[PDB]
Design a protein around this ligand. Structure first.
Ligand SMILES: CCCCCCCCCCCCCCCCCC(=O)OC[C@H](COP(=O)([O-])OCC(O)COP(=O)([O-])OC[C@@H](COC(=O)CCCCCCCCCCCCCCCCC)OC(=O)CCCCCCCCCCCCCCCCC)OC(=O)CCCCCCCCCCCCCCCCC
Ligand SMILES: CCCCCCCCCCCCCCCCCC(=O)OC[C@H](COP(=O)([O-])OCC(O)COP(=O)([O-])OC[C@@H](COC(=O)CCCCCCCCCCCCCCCCC)OC(=O)CCCCCCCCCCCCCCCCC)OC(=O)CCCCCCCCCCCCCCCCC
Ligand SMILES: CCCCCCCCCCCCCCCCCC(=O)OC[C@H](COP(=O)([O-])OCC[N+](C)(C)C)OC(=O)CCCCCCCCCCCCCCCCC
Ligand SMILES: CCCCCCCCCCCCCCCCCC(=O)OC[C@H](COP(=O)(O)OCCN)OC(=O)CCCCCCCCCCCCCCCCC
Ligand SMILES: [Zn+2]
Lengths: 165, 48, 66, 57, 265, 41, 111, 157, 297
């Protein structure tokens, strides 16, 4: 099918676009309401809150109650005392529940790098300027290339290669 | 007595100075393009 | 066009204009502000036409040379 | 106090319905000096914030 | 037009500017030797024409508030280049005054300026020279986004039934209304607060604070937009077509003594 | 820095020219109350 | 209110498999990709070495190609100046040694 | 049995603005399509639904105008337009654009339609991860809005 | 699968289905569950919900702001009108004072417009960030759906919550229509007329405590104000049953019936139409009027 090859509906023009069976999934839905195409074979776990992180620079912007409502887990082994809650498709609210166990993904290197880009450096409108010495090297390279070009033009035209003087 | 400027204040004037649609051709009730020979040229003609 | 640094610093997220203390060009290398002045294409013509003048005067040697 | 919108139910004279810019009367040099002072205060606060974050995360 | 600037320093026979123009463009010996052919009348105000247009006017020139308006600095340009300017301006001002003296509570005034002209190409709606950054906050919004879509064709394109597109369940519930009123012991549910599109009426008019509550006066400036390539205007409820044709005939009949003595060659 | 503007109140620029007040343009230097409130001081 | 909550503390989900890996290898597309990989690993690769083992002590008796005869040793008097000065092919390392070709070194920088 | 945690999308700024309110942003960036030639033919011969159009006031009357909403800066003129042919005597070859002051009643005297182009500013919390996760009240918002009205705020560019 | 050209959210095509297919048992169950319903003509709903006094459909806080600004402007008028000097006769001085008053009012009108714009901007902010002003479960239903695309119950709940998030002086609720409430409640009209007469008498006393010429001018103004205020509250206050009984003209009775029908369509229609039927011998009309007074009124 040309339509399906070029990322279209396919044979049926009223058909959708996503085929999560072969890896064509919806990132927006996953980020907002979680991967509801894994809903049949995955279940939320229900029962260490997040209040211990209420004093950190980036999490201090939240209220105490908000962090108290969040319950954490080690994220490796199943808590044997934790019940299982069925994951209901077509329900946009279950991914945001406070009764389900969660995992503190605030020590992830990507998390730290993002928040540092926002909370750990002086804001520069130009990412190249966010690195001072590299910008220095780059402008120096530009000047070097200008000089090299001028010298090469001078040498090739006049037939003397500047090494004997 | 001067209040804070607002875009719909009482002291806003029609923008007839800065041109926007330069190549337009005005329409509406307009005179016939009469052509008398030896008469002064009309202001609204292509000739001056 | 005059700078807008007073409004920028007194505005809503002043932390974004701290770099303005460093080697920075406001027109080129700074976060635009909601109250910034409108920059035109050819400022010389943009400033001369509303006054009725053309940008360059042949009497001035600098204008003639440019 | 400069943190709130004007409530008309508490206004006593029409002059209270206009915004007041304390620095509208300063000269160019004084205004520039004031802006630079505010910029340096902001710079100090930003550096303190950056230190606090980089030490904790 | 053009602003000559300093007339004094450009009248001299020999000038740096004239020599530069000769060298690079705009001047030559043809102007020094034959000014009557290549300079001739030049470009400037025509005092004789201004006097003629002034003395052809009726007593309207006395009764017009033009000389106190912010556009009074353009009096000579419009007296010279707009024959019958004062009579037309007097009719315009009397039209505004009679709209002001109406019996309607809302006085609508038509506004036309450089923005009142539509165009099929977006670069024609900006001031020249164009701003450095344009359409920063997105492009145009089409009025057609507020019209009902072609439901039948939309269903048909998808291979859906669409049989009952015009048959909808009725809805009679208190849960569907947020605007509740009590009118003489009757609790009327009617409407939902939508937001910015429910307050278009008040945000468009400005009150006369001295007018009593039983005889309100509101001022509204109605903007007018036209294509200028259409040749036919349809004002809607503001002006009927028959009245517009009548006004066209009368305007062309009155403003004829100001136009008949000139040729367009 | 030059003449930095103070505040962010509306200014007539290229992006915005405002809504003209035709009544003030026409009734310039002439009262309106002789028409809206005839006969009253 | 913001989605950042689920970015900061994403929910933890329960599986019936010992790892996501196993659970992720019940999709038929991943199974077919693994099958293609196994096809290439099993057939061609194991066979290749097999042939290498089968003909380990036997000659490569393919006749050599004939490039340039004896009467055309001068290449019809054609110029043969390489951009690196001498008249040796780039990767003819041994031939370079008989024509130096690398004594004419330049400077590290413009001077 | 095992626990899985899907890797979240950490990007902030424009992406997090899009993912916080996907309905509004999609509305802003959702393409809609116009009718082809055969579809125009099939639409022009569809029937009216009821005799209401003979009595009611059309959409685009002096009392029932076409109100439209753009995003921008307060007081900036709004760009709006027709697709052409709202009237029999109006052109329909291509879309026709318009520049109009905000929050004012304008009349197109090509078609005869009254419209209310108006601006809503997209003031949103600084997206750096400090956005609030639970219902917020009017105090902090009051301060931010006061500062924006009095001085203005940066642009997300 | 190696590419992904998705968008933030796919467009939504409505599914129409149709009116419910309720069987006989379901039909009877529904009919037995309904209240005592009175089906109303569209004219009745129109007169109930017509725009009479609040011409511009302005909310409460806008009217309050306008009245407050008028009070503040009046408190400052004498200072602005004090000491004016101009070369001319009395008429020229009067025109100068009129121009000064106009300038004062134009100054005060701009502050009011600025404040209206500011409150409108606050409410625009409320709409622009709905998910940040809502609790669960309405938050996700505001996140995923636009106003036209919500269920009626969820739509109403979301809008009410967003309105109530604001302080009392920013909530956008329509102001009361004096003429409407007077037209649909006879006591309210009587109270309004009593208030008008009380204010007229008090103003007459205040005037009588003033020098002569001002007395005549202000008394004429008071008479005009009372007349127009009454005509504003109830234009048909002169169509009394006494007047109806005194009217023996068919055209006049028709005019009265039209004027009442425009205003409220109340039992005075029964009176007018009964007197018209008697004068013309319309037995069918009399039967219909009996039915109406039994059911309609
Ligand atoms: C040896 C000479 C040494 C220096 C001598 C003293 C300076 C002389 C010039 C001068 O006075 O300049 C100041 C003068 C400004 O002074 P000013 O006018 O008093 O003040 C104006 C305001 O400040 C600001 O007002 P503004 O923004 O309105 O500017 C005035 C306005 C005035 O402009 C105009 O009026 C319009 C001109 C542009 C027209 C574009 C529209 C389309 C075409 C229309 C038709 C006309 C075409 C031209 C005429 C043809 C005949 C009909 O615009 C311009 O002048 C800019 C026009 C673009 C010119 C340069 C563009 C970059 C170079 C492109 C390649 C050049 C050829 C390379 C060949 C190899 O002009 C500039 O500054 C222009 C920019 C110059 C720098 C360019 C960027 C650097 C380029 C470096 C690389 C060059 C090539 C590679 C070389 C090898 C490596 C390094
Ligand atoms: C403008 C160009 C418009 C036409 C091409 C559109 C894209 C084609 C599909 C593609 O790129 O898949 C990405 C493919 C992975 O795609 P995927 O989304 O993972 O899954 C495949 C689809 O489900 C689609 O899988 P499928 O089930 O639709 O099968 C693909 C279909 C369509 O394949 C073709 O049309 C291939 C045409 C090349 C000649 C061989 C067939 C005749 O192939 C056939 O029907 C024939 C198979 C080969 C028969 C050989 C003997 C005859 O990755 C690569 O191929 C990587 C290399 C870069 C490919 C080109 C990228 C686009 C740049 C322009 C390409 C213009 C030349 C034509 C393409 C092939 C190279 C000569
Ligand atoms: C036959 C050729 C058709 C045109 C080229 C293919 C094309 O536009 O593909 C778009 C499509 C994507 O376009 P798209 O974004 O419109 O499709 C996705 C549609 N929605 C949003 C509904 C899901 O590209 C591909 O499928 C892969 C790249 C093909 C183009 C390769 C470069 C061609 C350069 C010369 C032209
Ligand atoms: C024939 C001989 C030439 C042959 C080679 C050239 C080939 C043809 C032309 C190619 C195009 C060249 C264009 C001109 C480049 C000149 C260098 C330049 O523009 O440098 C800009 C750079 C800006 O640095 P930035 O980090 O942006 O800092 C801003 C303020 N802090 O600033 C710098 O780098 C430093 C300042 C440089 C100023 C200009 C040079 C004097
Ligand atoms: Zn149109």
């Amino acid at each position: 099918m040309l339509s399906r090859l070029l990322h279209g509906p396919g044979s049926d023009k009223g058909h959708g676009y996503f085929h999560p069976d072969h890896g064509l999934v919806d990132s927006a839905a996953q980020n907002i309401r979680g991967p509801y195409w894994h809903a049949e074979n995955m279940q939320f776990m229900q029962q260490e809150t997040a209040a211990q992180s209420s004093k950190l620079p980036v999490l201090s912007a939240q209220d105490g109650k908000t962090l108290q409502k969040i319950q954490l887990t080690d994220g490796s082994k199943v808590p044997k005392a934790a019940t299982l809650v069925k994951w209901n498709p077509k329900s946009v609210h279950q991914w945001h529940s406070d009764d389900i166990l969660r995992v503190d993904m605030t020590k992830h290197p990507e998390w730290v790098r993002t928040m540092r880009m926002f909370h750990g450096t002086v804001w520069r409108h130009r990412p190249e300027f966010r690195h001072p010495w590299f910008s220095r090297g780059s402008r120096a390279s530009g000047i070097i290339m200008l000089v090299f070009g001028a010298v090469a033009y001078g040498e090739i035209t006049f037939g003397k290669r500047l090494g004997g003087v | 007595l001067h209040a804070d400027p607002i875009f719909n204040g009482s002291k806003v004037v029609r923008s007839i100075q800065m041109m926007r649609s330069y190549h337009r051709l005005p329409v509406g009730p307009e005179p016939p393009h009469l052509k008398i020979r030896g008469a002064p040229l009309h202001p609204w003609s292509m000739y001056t | 066009h005059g700078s807008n640094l007073y409004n920028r610093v007194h505005g809503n997220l002043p932390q974004l204009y701290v770099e303005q203390l460093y080697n920075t060009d406001e027109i080129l290398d700074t976060v635009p502000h909601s109250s910034d002045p409108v920059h035109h294409m050819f400022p010389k013509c943009a400033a001369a036409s509303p006054l009725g003048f053309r940008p360059y005067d042949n009497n001035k040697l600098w204008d003639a040379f440019v | 106090h400069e943190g709130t919108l004007v409530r008309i139910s508490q206004v006593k004279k029409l002059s209270e319905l206009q915004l007041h810019f304390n620095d509208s009367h300063l000269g160019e040099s004084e205004l520039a000096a004031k802006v630079l002072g505010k910029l340096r205060k902001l710079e100090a606060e930003v550096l303190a914030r950056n230190q606090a974050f980089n030490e904790a995360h | 037009g053009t602003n000559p600037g300093d007339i004094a320093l450009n009248s001299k026979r020999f000038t740096v500017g004239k020599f530069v123009a000769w060298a690079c463009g705009g001047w030559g010996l043809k102007d020094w030797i034959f000014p009557s052919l290549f300079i001739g009348r030049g470009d400037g105000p025509d005092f004789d024409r201004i006097v003629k247009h002034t003395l052809q006017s009726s007593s309207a020139i006395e009764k017009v508030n033009w000389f106190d308006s912010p556009f009074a600095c353009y009096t000579e340009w419009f007296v010279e280049h707009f024959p019958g300017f004062f009579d037309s301006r007097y009719r315009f001002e009397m039209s505004a005054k009679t709209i002001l003296a109406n019996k309607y509570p809302i006085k609508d005034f038509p506004v036309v300026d450089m923005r009142s002209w539509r165009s099929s190409r977006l670069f024609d709606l900006f001031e020249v020279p164009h701003p450095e950054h344009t359409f920063v906050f997105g492009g145009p919004v089409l009025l057609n986004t507020e019209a009902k879509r072609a439901e039948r064709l939309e269903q048909e394109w998808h291979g859906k039934d669409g049989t009952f597109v015009d048959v909808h369940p009725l809805n009679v519930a208190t849960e569907s209304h947020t605007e509740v009123s009590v009118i003489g012991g009757i609790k009327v549910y009617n409407g939902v607060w939508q937001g910015g599109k429910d307050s278009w009426k008040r945000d468009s008019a400005k009150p006369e604070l001295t007018a009593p509550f039983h005889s309100p006066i509101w001022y509204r400036n109605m903007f007018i937009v036209k294509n200028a390539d259409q040749l036919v205007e349809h004002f809607g409820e503001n002006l009927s077509d028959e009245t517009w044709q009548e006004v066209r005939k009368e305007h062309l009949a009155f403003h004829e003594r100001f136009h008949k003595d000139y040729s367009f060659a | 820095l030059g003449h930095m503007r103070v505040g962010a109140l509306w200014q007539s620029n290229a992006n915005s020219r405002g809504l003209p007040n035709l009544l003030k343009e026409v009734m310039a230097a002439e009262p309106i109350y002789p028409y809206t409130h005839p006969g009253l001081s | 209110m913001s989605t950042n909550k689920n970015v900061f503390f994403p929910p933890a989900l329960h599986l019936k498999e010992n790892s996501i890996f196993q659970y992720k290898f019940k999709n038929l597309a991943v199974r077919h990709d693994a099958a293609r990989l196994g096809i290439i690993l099993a057939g061609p690769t194991l066979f290749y070495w097999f042939t290498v083992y089968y003909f380990k002590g036997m000659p490569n008796g393919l006749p050599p190609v004939l490039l340039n005869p004896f009467v055309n040793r001068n290449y019809r008097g054609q110029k043969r100046d390489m951009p690196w000065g001498t008249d040796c092919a780039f990767l003819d390392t041994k031939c370079h040694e008989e024509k130096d070709t690398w004594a004419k070194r330049g400077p590290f920088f413009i001077i | 049995d095992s626990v899985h945690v899907f890797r979240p999308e950490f990007a902030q700024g424009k992406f997090r603005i899009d993912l916080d309110q996907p309905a509004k942003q999609n509305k802003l960036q959702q393409q809609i399509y116009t009718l082809t030639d055969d579809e125009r033919e099939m639409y022009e011969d569809e029937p009216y639904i009821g005799v209401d159009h003979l009595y009611e006031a059309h959409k685009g009357s002096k009392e029932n105008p076409v109100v439209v909403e753009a995003i921008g800066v307060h007081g900036n003129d709004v760009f709006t337009g027709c697709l052409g042919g709202c009237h029999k005597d109006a052109a329909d070859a291509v879309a026709y654009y318009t520049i109009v002051p905000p929050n004012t009643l304008a009349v197109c005297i090509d078609c005869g339609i009254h419209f209310v182009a108006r601006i809503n500013e997209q003031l949103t919390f600084w997206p750096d991860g400090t956005q609030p996760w639970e219902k917020v009240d009017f105090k902090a918002v009051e301060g931010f809005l006061y500062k924006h009205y009095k001085y203005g705020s940066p642009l997300m560019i | 699968s190696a590419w992904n050209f998705q968008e933030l959210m796919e467009s939504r095509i409505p599914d129409y289905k149709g009116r419910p297919n309720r069987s006989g048992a379901e039909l009877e169950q529904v009919k037995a569950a309904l209240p005592k319903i009175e089906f109303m003509t569209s004219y009745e709903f129109d007169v109930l919900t017509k725009t009479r006094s609040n011409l511009t459909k302005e909310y409460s806080y806008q009217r309050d702001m306008r009245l407050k600004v008028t009070e503040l402007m009046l408190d400052e008028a004498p200072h602005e009108l004090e000491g004016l000097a101009v070369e001319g006769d009395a008429a020229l001085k009067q025109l100068a004072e009129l121009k000064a008053l106009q300038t004062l009012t134009e100054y005060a009108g701009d502050l009011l417009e600025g404040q209206n714009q500011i409150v409108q901007r606050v409410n625009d902010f409320v709409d622009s960030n709905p998910v940040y002003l809502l609790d669960q479960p309405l938050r996700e239903e505001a996140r995923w759906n636009l106003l036209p695309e919500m269920d009626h119950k969820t739509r109403s709940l979301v809008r009410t919550e967003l309105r109530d998030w604001l302080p009392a002086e920013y909530r956008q609720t329509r102001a009361v229509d004096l003429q409407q409430v007077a037209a649909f409640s006879p006591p309210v009209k009587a109270d309004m007329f009593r208030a008008i007469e009380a204010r007229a008498k008090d103003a007459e006393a205040e005037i009588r405590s003033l020098p002569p010429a001002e007395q005549a001018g202000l008394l004429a103004l008071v008479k005009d104000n009372v007349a127009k205020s009454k005509a504003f509250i109830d234009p048909t206050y002169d169509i009394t049953p006494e007047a109806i009984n005194a009217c023996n003209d068919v055209d006049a009775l028709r005019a009265m019936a039209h004027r009442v029908t425009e205003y409220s369509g109340d039992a005075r229609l029964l009176a007018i139409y009964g007197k018209a039927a008697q004068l013309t011998g319309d037995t069918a009309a009399q039967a219909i009027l009996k039915e109406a007074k039994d059911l309609v009124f």
